[PDB]
């Protein structure tokens, strides 16, 4: 019934809703209005897909709630799988097992894929019989269309000893490794050919190459037990070896995206690092998002636009997203209602639109679900205006909450 992923803040964003002239539909693929910024996102999305130009930087700026993280998720969903999209917050680089500069380069290099195309051949069938002469033996395998004998040589019989003493299992044997994997007790047995040549297109980030080759069993990319790779040596020769895979047929590189949400949280050490990390061939596109105005940069006393130093703002293109009118607000609320299970009166939509246009958009989006539940209490089936008024009284927004501080409490 309920899987891991459930209804979140950006679930309705199925893509960046553009015509293929990179022209935004006023409402499509879950995205509403925000035309100039969305079409700018379209241009940079096609620039991502082209891939020929390295280390480009886009800042998407605007008030809180004006669709900028929504635009970033729209780019991620429009780009689809099998092109890296590494999404982090600026707060992620502040770490205790590695320095902020090193975490930032690691983020850069999770964001470049290497696409490597490999042919193996895979056996898949139901075990009919197996033998042991204490050592040599034989194995008979069955697909619904054929059966055969195989000779169990030393490595194969050793491998099959790992989970033995059962038959009728439907299993796969990789002729490269001898890696046995069993689907279960004959779940149905397989169709077609027993043994087939098979192709896999692995896409592996540069961070994964770097980590796998850092150490014996260095493939702990699963738990971040690396603490700063040996740059200029175990990282320069991986760049060289990938450049050797390329222009020969072994591999092709897939330059992805690094989305740094809330980049105002980086500090001037980190920004100074970005300056040069953006200038190499293996630099992905990074796009980054910021609410803040002209504010103090972290780590110093300097005021700057977006809280980003000016010598890095020189290095990027600044999309501006703009606040929403009544019509766009109403349409966003409708799409949120359609992503959730709720239905509302048109008068309820009107009241909620004015509520959200008064205080803030995100508060109204939150009220949707609360009003749905409130109507469910009285065993209604469509959210009415008095549901919204009740919920508006139960749950305050920041402005009215601040106004209610006409009594006193700690500081």
Partner 1 sequence: MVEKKTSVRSQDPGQRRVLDRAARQRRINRQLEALENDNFQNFQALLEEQNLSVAEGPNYLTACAGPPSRPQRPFCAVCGFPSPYTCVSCGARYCTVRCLGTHQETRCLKWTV
Partner 2 sequence: QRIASHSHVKGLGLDESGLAKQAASGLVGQENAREACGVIVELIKSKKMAGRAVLLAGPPGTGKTALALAIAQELGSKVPFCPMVGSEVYSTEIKKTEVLMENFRRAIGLRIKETKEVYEGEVTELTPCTISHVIIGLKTAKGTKQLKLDPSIFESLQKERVEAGDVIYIEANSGAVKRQGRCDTYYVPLPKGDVHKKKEIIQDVTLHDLDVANARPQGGQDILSMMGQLMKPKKTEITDKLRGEINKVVNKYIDQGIAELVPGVLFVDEVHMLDIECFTYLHRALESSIAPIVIFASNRGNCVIRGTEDITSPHGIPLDLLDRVMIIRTMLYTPQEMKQIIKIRAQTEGINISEEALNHLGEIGTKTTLRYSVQLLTPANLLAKINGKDSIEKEHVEEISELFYDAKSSAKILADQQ
Instruction: Give the separation between CA 53 and CA 157, rounded to whole angstroms.
Output: 51
Stretch that binds ligand ADP, among 42-50, 235-243, 360-368, 388-396 (CB under 6 A): 360-368
CA dihedral 389, 390, 395, 398 (to 10 degrees): 20
From the CB of 253, what's the least distance to partner 2, in Å? 8
Give the residue, chosen from 63, 159, 186, 195, that forms a contact with partner 1 under the rule CB under 8 A: 195
67 contact, one of ligand ADP, partner 1, partner 2, none, CB 5-8 Å limit per kind: ligand ADP
* 211 CB-near residues (< 8 Å, 6+ apart): 218, 219, 220, 221, 226, 229
From the CB of 133, what's the least distance to partner 1, in Å? 16
Question: How many degrees, rounded to 5, is the angle at CA 248 between CA 244 and CA 249?
Answer: 115
From the CB of 183, what's the least distance to partner 2, in Å? 28
> Is 34 among the residues that bind ligand ADP (CB under 6 A)?
yes
Question: Do the annotations mark residue 68 as ligand-binding?
Answer: yes
How many residues make contact with partner 2 (CB under 8 A)? 68
> Is 244 among the residues that bind partner 1 (CB under 8 A)?
no
> Is 361 among the residues that bind ligand ADP (CB under 6 A)?
yes
**Which of helix, strand or coil describes residue 9?**
coil
Of 117, 113, 51, 107, the residue nearest 81 (C-alpha): 113
> Is 193 among the residues that bind partner 1 (CB under 8 A)?
yes
From the CB of 257, what's the least distance to partner 1, in Å? 44
User: Cβ closer to partner 2: 314 or 346?
Assistant: 314
Question: Do the annotations mark residue 69 as ligand-binding?
Answer: yes
User: Cβ closer to partner 2: 56 or 330?
Assistant: 56
Give the residue, chosen from 14, 63, 150, 189, that forms a contact with partner 1 under the rule CB under 8 A: 150
Six token digits for residue 107: 């983020």
Residue 291: Cβ-neighbour burial (10 angstroms; 0-12, 13-18, 19+): middle
Question: Do the annotations mark residue 177 as ligand-binding?
Answer: no
In the DSSP assignment, the letter for residue 215 is S
Of 273, 351, 350, the residue nearest 103 (C-alpha): 273
Site for ligand ADP in 265-324 (CB under 6 A): 289, 291
Give the residue, chosen from 33, 74, 84, 255, that forms a contact with partner 2 under the rule CB under 8 A: 255
> Is 140 among the residues that bind partner 1 (CB under 8 A)?
yes
**Which of helix, strand or coil describes residue 209?**
helix
DSSP-assigned states of every residue in 91-139: GGG--SSS-HHHHHHHHHHHSEEEEEEEEEEEEEEEEEEE--B--BEEE
Instruction: Give the separation between CA 303 and CA 78, rounded to whole angstroms.
Output: 36
Instruction: Give the separation between CA 271 and CA 274, rounded to whole angstroms.
Output: 5
> Is 342 among the residues that bind ligand ADP (CB under 6 A)?
no
User: Cβ closer to partner 2: 235 or 336?
Assistant: 235
Instruction: Give the separation between CA 231 and CA 310, rounded to whole angstroms.
Output: 28
From the CB of 171, what's the least distance to partner 1, in Å? 17
> Is 340 among the residues that bind partner 1 (CB under 8 A)?
no
Of 43, 62, 61, 63, the residue nearest 53 (C-alpha): 43
Question: Do the annotations mark residue 105 as ligand-binding?
Answer: no
Q: What does the binding site for partner 2 look like in residue numbers (CB under 8 A)?
A: 21-22, 36, 39-40, 43-44, 46-47, 50-56, 58-59, 61, 63, 95-102, 215-216, 225, 227-228, 230, 232-233, 246-247, 253, 255, 268-270, 272-273, 275-283, 293-294, 305-306, 310-311, 313-320
Report the interface residues with partner 1, using CB under 8 A: 140, 145-150, 192-195
């Amino acid at each position: 019934v309920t899987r891991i992923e459930r209804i979140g803040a950006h679930s309705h964003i199925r893509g960046l809703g553009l015509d293929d002239a990179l022209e935004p539909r006023q409402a499509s693929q879950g995205m509403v209005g925000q035309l100039a910024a969305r079409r700018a996102a379209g241009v940079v999305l096609e620039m991502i897909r082209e891939g020929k130009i390295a280390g480009r930087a886009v800042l998407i700026a605007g008030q809180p709630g004006t669709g900028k993280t929504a635009i970033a998720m729209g780019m991620a969903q429009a780009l689809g799988p099998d092109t890296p999209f590494t999404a982090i917050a600026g707060s992620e680089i502040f770490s205790l097992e590695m320095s902020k500069t090193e975490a930032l380069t690691q983020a850069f290099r999770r964001s470049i894929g290497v696409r490597i195309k490999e042919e193996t051949e895979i056996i898949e069938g139901e075990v009919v019989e197996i033998q042991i002469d204490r050592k040599v033996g034989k194995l008979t395998l069955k697909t619904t269309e054929m059966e055969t004998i195989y000779d169990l040589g030393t490595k194969m019989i050793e491998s099959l000893t790992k989970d033995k003493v059962q038959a009728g299992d439907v299993i796969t044997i990789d002729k490269a490794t001898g890696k046995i994997s069993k689907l279960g007790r004959s779940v149905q047995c397989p169709d077609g050919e027993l043994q087939k040549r098979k192709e896999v297109v692995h896409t592996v980030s540069l961070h994964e190459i770097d980590v796998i080759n850092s150490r014996t069993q260095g493939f702990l990319a699963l738990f971040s037990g690396d603490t700063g790779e040996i740059k200029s040596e175990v990282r320069e020769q991986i760049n060289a070896k990938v450049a050797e895979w390329r222009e020969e047929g072994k591999a092709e590189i897939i330059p992805g995206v690094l989305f740094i949400d809330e980049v105002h949280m980086l500090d001037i050490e980190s920004f100074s690092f970005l300056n040069r990390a953006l200038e190499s061939d293996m630099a992905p596109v990074l796009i980054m998002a910021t609410n803040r105005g002209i504010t103090r940069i972290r780590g110093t006393s300097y005021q700057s636009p977006h809280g980003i130093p000016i010598d890095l703002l020189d290095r990027l293109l600044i999309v501006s997203t703009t606040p929403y009118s009544e019509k766009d607000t109403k349409q966003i609320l409708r799409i949120r209602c359609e992503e959730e299970d709720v239905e509302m009166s048109e008068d309820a939509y009107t009241v909620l639109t004015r509520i959200g246009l008064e205080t803030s958009l995100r508060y109204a989006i939150q009220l949707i679900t609360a009003a749905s539940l409130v109507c469910r209490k009285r065993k209604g089936t469509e959210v009415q205006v008095d549901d919204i008024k009740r919920v508006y009284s139960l749950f305050l927004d920041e402005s009215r909450s601040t106004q209610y501080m006409k009594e006193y409490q700690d500081a």
